[PDB]
């Protein structure tokens, strides 16, 4: 009725702070893993060159 | 021989019930050293070195309810 309640009440602030920091860390890790992937596609000049060769030019 | 008597804490028990029906923080302790036995980090003990905390706190409360209030005249230890 007296002791354990008081010590729990004393614990609350530090635990709240640490859990907030942990959530911020999770969000930071989520953001840090985001990279924009620039894809590379076959240049159409080679396609045009192959078209010309097929014409026997 | 069986003597029936009572302690002199009934009013203090009433006050404890009245003022501790709701939680309150404790930040000042008579014997704080029972909570901090290790001062150098990375040191740990496999023995239940923190078992004495509850008994320490209860003994402090009991002896303080008795002795400190005994200064009041006619209060009995
Ligand atoms: C022959 C004559 C009679 C006597 C017979 C005796 C037989 C003895 C047999 C042999 C025994 C040998 C060994 C003895 C060793 C003694 C050592 C000793 O004394 O050490 C000191 C030591 C002192 O301790 P303390 O630090 O003062 O704290 C103990 C306190 O009790 C306070 O501690 P606590 O507050 O932490 O306790 C918890 C407390 C938590 O707090 C509370 O609950 C608050 C209340 C506290 C009550 C207890 C305190 C009592 C205060 C004094 C008396 C109050 C008024 C009584 C009025 C009587 C009027 C005549 O809760 C309780 O106490 C639970 C009980 C609550 C009862 C509530 C009842 C409600 C009824 C409502 C009815 C409504 C009806 C409506 C109908 C409507 C119709 C229309 O005593 C003890 O630790 C206890 C010793 C007991 C040993 C066992 C004895 C055997 C049992 C006897 C029972 C007799 C019942 C019949 C009696 C009938 C009337 C005459
Ligand atoms: C942490 C430190 C705490 C320090 C507390 C300091 C308190 C200062 C008090 C100043 C004087 C007060 C005078 C009160 C007078 C009352 C009426 C009277 O006649 O008294 C005469 C009595 C006795 O005076 P007397 O000896 O002159 O009586 C003469 C009577 N004849 C002639 C019949 C013998 O006064 C006292 O006993 C006062 C002593 C107080 C000592 C300090 C006690 C502190 C511990 C108890 C704290 C309780 C807090 C509880 C809170 C709730 C807890 C959940």
Short mmCIF file of C-alpha atoms and ligand atoms in Angstrom, two decimals:
data_model
loop_
_atom_site.label_atom_id
_atom_site.label_comp_id
_atom_site.label_asym_id
_atom_site.label_seq_id
_atom_site.Cartn_x
_atom_site.Cartn_y
_atom_site.Cartn_z
CA UNK A 1 0.00 0.00 0.00
CA UNK A 2 2.86 2.45 0.61
CA UNK A 3 6.35 1.36 -0.41
CA UNK A 4 6.03 -0.43 -3.75
CA UNK A 5 3.62 2.27 -5.01
CA UNK A 6 6.07 5.01 -4.09
CA UNK A 7 8.96 3.31 -5.85
CA UNK A 8 6.84 2.66 -8.95
CA UNK A 9 5.90 6.34 -8.97
CA UNK A 10 9.59 7.19 -8.73
CA UNK A 11 10.37 4.86 -11.64
CA UNK A 12 7.77 6.31 -13.99
CA UNK A 13 9.64 9.40 -15.33
CA UNK A 14 12.87 7.67 -16.31
CA UNK A 15 11.05 4.81 -18.02
CA UNK A 16 8.85 7.24 -19.93
CA UNK A 17 11.90 9.19 -21.09
CA UNK A 18 13.74 6.04 -22.16
CA UNK A 19 10.75 4.69 -24.09
CA UNK A 20 10.31 8.01 -25.88
CA UNK A 21 13.99 7.91 -26.84
CA UNK A 22 13.56 4.32 -28.04
CA UNK A 23 10.62 5.26 -30.26
CA UNK A 24 12.62 8.18 -31.67
CA UNK A 25 15.45 5.74 -32.38
CA UNK A 26 13.06 3.44 -34.24
CA UNK A 27 11.79 6.33 -36.36
CA UNK A 28 15.35 7.46 -37.07
CA UNK A 29 16.32 3.96 -38.18
CA UNK A 30 13.25 3.79 -40.42
CA UNK A 31 14.20 7.08 -42.07
CA UNK A 32 17.88 6.19 -42.43
CA UNK A 33 17.17 3.02 -44.43
CA UNK A 34 15.34 4.92 -47.20
CA UNK A 35 17.36 5.29 -50.41
CA UNK A 36 16.09 6.28 -53.84
CA UNK A 37 16.95 3.56 -56.36
CA UNK A 38 17.72 5.05 -59.78
CA UNK A 39 17.18 2.34 -62.38
CA UNK A 40 19.11 2.13 -65.64
CA UNK A 41 17.36 1.22 -68.89
CA UNK A 42 18.83 0.17 -72.22
CA UNK A 43 19.72 3.22 -74.28
CA UNK A 44 17.53 3.51 -77.36
CA UNK A 45 20.51 4.51 -79.51
CA UNK A 46 21.65 0.88 -79.61
CA UNK A 47 18.12 -0.11 -80.63
CA UNK A 48 18.29 2.43 -83.45
CA UNK A 49 21.71 1.10 -84.46
CA UNK A 50 20.44 -2.49 -84.57
CA UNK A 51 17.46 -1.35 -86.64
CA UNK A 52 19.84 0.22 -89.15
CA UNK A 53 21.96 -2.93 -89.36
CA UNK A 54 18.87 -5.06 -89.97
CA UNK A 55 18.12 -2.82 -92.97
CA UNK A 56 21.50 -3.94 -94.43
CA UNK A 57 22.63 -0.29 -94.61
CA UNK B 1 0.96 -15.63 31.49
CA UNK B 2 -0.66 -13.85 28.53
CA UNK B 3 -0.84 -10.05 28.55
CA UNK B 4 -3.04 -8.27 26.01
CA UNK B 5 -1.88 -4.76 25.15
CA UNK B 6 -1.70 -2.41 22.18
CA UNK B 7 0.96 -0.32 20.51
CA UNK B 8 0.79 3.48 20.57
CA UNK B 9 0.54 3.84 16.78
CA UNK B 10 -3.23 3.68 16.23
CA UNK B 11 -3.54 7.38 15.40
CA UNK B 12 -0.45 7.14 13.21
CA UNK B 13 -1.94 4.09 11.50
CA UNK B 14 -5.07 6.14 10.87
CA UNK B 15 -2.99 8.94 9.38
CA UNK B 16 -1.11 6.47 7.18
CA UNK B 17 -4.41 5.11 5.89
CA UNK B 18 -5.75 8.62 5.28
CA UNK B 19 -2.69 10.10 3.57
CA UNK B 20 -1.48 7.01 1.66
CA UNK B 21 -4.69 5.78 0.07
CA UNK B 22 -3.14 7.43 -3.01
CA UNK B 23 0.37 7.06 -4.36
CA UNK B 24 3.17 9.49 -3.52
CA UNK B 25 6.81 9.65 -4.53
CA UNK B 26 9.60 9.00 -2.03
CA UNK B 27 12.89 10.81 -2.61
CA UNK B 28 14.39 11.17 0.90
CA UNK B 29 15.47 8.01 2.72
CA UNK B 30 17.22 7.73 6.07
CA UNK B 31 19.51 4.92 4.86
CA UNK B 32 20.01 5.41 1.13
CA UNK B 33 23.10 3.17 1.01
CA UNK B 34 20.97 0.01 0.91
CA UNK B 35 20.00 0.87 -2.68
CA UNK B 36 23.50 1.72 -3.98
CA UNK B 37 25.90 -1.02 -2.92
CA UNK B 38 28.00 -0.98 -6.11
CA UNK B 39 29.70 2.25 -7.16
CA UNK B 40 32.07 1.05 -9.91
CA UNK B 41 30.27 0.18 -13.13
CA UNK B 42 30.55 -3.26 -14.78
CA UNK B 43 30.59 -4.88 -11.31
CA UNK B 44 27.73 -7.26 -10.58
CA UNK B 45 26.83 -9.77 -7.88
CA UNK B 46 25.04 -13.09 -8.27
CA UNK B 47 23.88 -12.90 -4.64
CA UNK B 48 20.56 -11.29 -3.76
CA UNK B 49 22.29 -8.17 -2.42
CA UNK B 50 19.10 -6.09 -2.77
CA UNK B 51 17.00 -8.34 -0.52
CA UNK B 52 17.51 -6.04 2.49
CA UNK B 53 15.82 -2.99 0.94
CA UNK B 54 12.26 -3.82 1.97
CA UNK B 55 13.19 -4.77 5.51
CA UNK B 56 15.35 -1.66 5.79
CA UNK B 57 12.53 0.63 4.69
CA UNK B 58 9.98 -1.02 6.97
CA UNK B 59 12.31 -0.91 9.98
CA UNK B 60 13.04 2.75 9.32
CA UNK B 61 9.33 3.52 9.12
CA UNK B 62 8.51 1.60 12.30
CA UNK B 63 11.37 2.99 14.40
CA UNK B 64 10.70 6.51 13.11
CA UNK B 65 7.01 6.32 13.97
CA UNK B 66 8.03 5.27 17.47
CA UNK B 67 11.20 7.17 18.37
CA UNK B 68 10.70 10.51 16.62
CA UNK B 69 7.16 10.87 17.96
CA UNK B 70 8.35 9.90 21.45
CA UNK B 71 9.68 13.43 21.95
CA UNK B 72 6.06 14.46 22.37
CA UNK B 73 5.32 14.31 26.07
CA UNK B 74 3.59 11.16 27.38
CA UNK B 75 4.16 9.35 24.07
CA UNK B 76 5.19 5.77 24.79
CA UNK B 77 7.88 3.65 23.14
C1 LIG C 1 -12.13 -13.83 28.05
C2 LIG C 1 -12.26 -12.37 27.70
C3 LIG C 1 -12.07 -12.07 26.22
C4 LIG C 1 -10.66 -12.28 25.69
C5 LIG C 1 -10.35 -13.70 25.27
C6 LIG C 1 -8.91 -13.90 24.83
C7 LIG C 1 -8.53 -15.35 24.55
C8 LIG C 1 -7.04 -15.58 24.48
C9 LIG C 1 -6.63 -17.01 24.20
C10 LIG C 1 -5.17 -17.31 24.53
C11 LIG C 1 -4.17 -16.46 23.76
C12 LIG C 1 -2.74 -16.63 24.24
C13 LIG C 1 -1.73 -15.73 23.53
C14 LIG C 1 -2.01 -14.24 23.66
C15 LIG C 1 -0.86 -13.35 23.23
C16 LIG C 1 -1.20 -11.87 23.22
C17 LIG C 1 -0.05 -10.99 22.77
C18 LIG C 1 -0.44 -9.55 22.60
O1 LIG C 1 -1.44 -9.05 23.05
O2 LIG C 1 0.47 -8.88 21.88
C19 LIG C 1 0.23 -7.48 21.63
C20 LIG C 1 -0.05 -7.29 20.17
C21 LIG C 1 -0.36 -5.85 19.86
O3 LIG C 1 -0.29 -5.63 18.44
P1 LIG C 1 -0.53 -4.16 17.89
O4 LIG C 1 0.75 -3.63 17.36
O5 LIG C 1 -1.23 -3.42 18.96
O6 LIG C 1 -1.57 -4.32 16.69
C22 LIG C 1 -2.64 -5.27 16.80
C23 LIG C 1 -3.96 -4.57 16.62
O7 LIG C 1 -5.01 -5.54 16.57
C24 LIG C 1 -4.03 -3.71 15.37
O8 LIG C 1 -3.32 -4.36 14.30
P2 LIG C 1 -3.75 -4.06 12.79
O9 LIG C 1 -4.56 -2.83 12.76
O10 LIG C 1 -2.56 -4.16 11.92
O11 LIG C 1 -4.73 -5.28 12.47
C25 LIG C 1 -5.40 -5.35 11.19
C26 LIG C 1 -6.61 -4.45 11.24
C27 LIG C 1 -6.58 -3.40 10.16
O12 LIG C 1 -7.34 -2.26 10.63
C28 LIG C 1 -8.65 -2.43 10.77
O13 LIG C 1 -9.28 -3.31 10.25
C29 LIG C 1 -9.25 -1.37 11.65
C30 LIG C 1 -9.94 -1.94 12.88
C31 LIG C 1 -8.96 -2.49 13.90
C32 LIG C 1 -9.58 -3.46 14.89
C33 LIG C 1 -8.57 -4.09 15.83
C34 LIG C 1 -8.09 -3.16 16.92
C35 LIG C 1 -8.84 -3.32 18.23
C36 LIG C 1 -8.79 -2.09 19.11
C37 LIG C 1 -9.27 -2.31 20.53
C38 LIG C 1 -10.69 -2.86 20.64
C39 LIG C 1 -11.72 -2.12 19.80
C40 LIG C 1 -13.09 -1.99 20.47
C41 LIG C 1 -13.65 -3.29 21.03
C42 LIG C 1 -14.92 -3.11 21.83
C43 LIG C 1 -15.14 -4.18 22.89
C44 LIG C 1 -16.33 -3.93 23.79
C45 LIG C 1 -16.40 -4.90 24.95
O14 LIG C 1 -7.78 -5.29 11.00
C46 LIG C 1 -8.22 -6.05 12.02
O15 LIG C 1 -7.86 -5.91 13.16
C47 LIG C 1 -9.20 -7.07 11.54
C48 LIG C 1 -10.40 -7.22 12.47
C49 LIG C 1 -11.48 -6.19 12.21
C50 LIG C 1 -12.77 -6.46 12.94
C51 LIG C 1 -13.96 -5.66 12.43
C52 LIG C 1 -15.29 -6.11 13.01
C53 LIG C 1 -16.50 -5.40 12.43
C54 LIG C 1 -17.82 -5.91 12.97
C55 LIG C 1 -19.04 -5.17 12.45
C56 LIG C 1 -20.35 -5.75 12.94
C57 LIG C 1 -21.59 -5.02 12.46
C58 LIG C 1 -22.89 -5.66 12.91
C59 LIG C 1 -24.14 -4.92 12.47
C60 LIG C 1 -25.42 -5.59 12.92
C61 LIG C 1 -26.68 -4.82 12.55
C62 LIG C 1 -27.96 -5.49 13.04
C63 LIG C 1 -29.21 -4.71 12.68
O16 LIG C 1 -1.24 -8.08 19.85
C64 LIG C 1 -1.26 -8.71 18.66
O17 LIG C 1 -0.43 -8.57 17.81
C65 LIG C 1 -2.47 -9.59 18.55
C66 LIG C 1 -2.62 -10.54 19.72
C67 LIG C 1 -3.78 -11.51 19.55
C68 LIG C 1 -3.45 -12.93 19.97
C69 LIG C 1 -4.58 -13.92 19.76
C70 LIG C 1 -5.66 -13.85 20.82
C71 LIG C 1 -6.78 -14.86 20.60
C72 LIG C 1 -8.02 -14.28 19.94
C73 LIG C 1 -8.96 -13.57 20.90
C74 LIG C 1 -10.25 -13.11 20.26
C75 LIG C 1 -11.35 -12.75 21.24
C76 LIG C 1 -12.68 -12.44 20.57
C77 LIG C 1 -13.87 -12.34 21.51
C78 LIG C 1 -13.90 -11.07 22.35
C79 LIG C 1 -15.31 -10.67 22.78
C80 LIG C 1 -15.39 -9.42 23.63
C81 LIG C 1 -14.87 -9.63 25.03
C1 LIG C 2 11.89 16.88 10.53
C2 LIG C 2 12.02 17.68 11.80
C3 LIG C 2 10.69 18.02 12.44
C4 LIG C 2 10.77 19.12 13.48
C5 LIG C 2 9.44 19.52 14.07
C6 LIG C 2 9.50 20.75 14.95
C7 LIG C 2 8.18 21.12 15.59
C8 LIG C 2 8.24 22.39 16.42
C9 LIG C 2 7.15 22.51 17.46
C10 LIG C 2 7.15 23.82 18.22
C11 LIG C 2 6.40 23.79 19.53
C12 LIG C 2 5.02 23.17 19.44
C13 LIG C 2 4.20 23.29 20.71
C14 LIG C 2 2.93 22.46 20.68
C15 LIG C 2 2.09 22.59 21.93
C16 LIG C 2 0.96 21.58 22.00
C17 LIG C 2 0.10 21.72 23.25
C18 LIG C 2 0.86 21.52 24.52
O1 LIG C 2 0.51 21.90 25.60
O2 LIG C 2 1.99 20.84 24.31
C19 LIG C 2 2.85 20.65 25.46
C20 LIG C 2 3.88 19.61 25.13
C21 LIG C 2 4.83 19.40 26.28
O3 LIG C 2 5.19 20.68 26.84
P1 LIG C 2 5.50 20.77 28.40
O4 LIG C 2 6.58 19.82 28.73
O5 LIG C 2 5.68 22.21 28.72
O6 LIG C 2 4.15 20.30 29.12
C22 LIG C 2 3.84 20.79 30.45
C23 LIG C 2 2.67 19.98 30.92
N1 LIG C 2 2.74 19.48 32.35
C24 LIG C 2 3.08 20.60 33.27
C25 LIG C 2 1.42 18.90 32.75
C26 LIG C 2 3.79 18.41 32.47
O7 LIG C 2 4.64 20.05 23.97
C27 LIG C 2 5.40 19.14 23.35
O8 LIG C 2 5.55 18.02 23.75
C28 LIG C 2 6.01 19.69 22.10
C29 LIG C 2 7.28 18.97 21.68
C30 LIG C 2 7.47 18.90 20.18
C31 LIG C 2 8.79 18.28 19.76
C32 LIG C 2 8.91 17.99 18.27
C33 LIG C 2 8.22 16.71 17.83
C34 LIG C 2 8.53 16.32 16.40
C35 LIG C 2 8.10 14.91 16.03
C36 LIG C 2 6.61 14.74 15.81
C37 LIG C 2 6.14 15.21 14.45
C38 LIG C 2 4.70 14.83 14.13
C39 LIG C 2 4.28 15.16 12.71
C40 LIG C 2 3.08 14.37 12.23
C41 LIG C 2 2.66 14.70 10.81
C42 LIG C 2 1.81 13.63 10.15
C43 LIG C 2 2.57 12.36 9.83
C44 LIG C 2 1.83 11.44 8.89
#
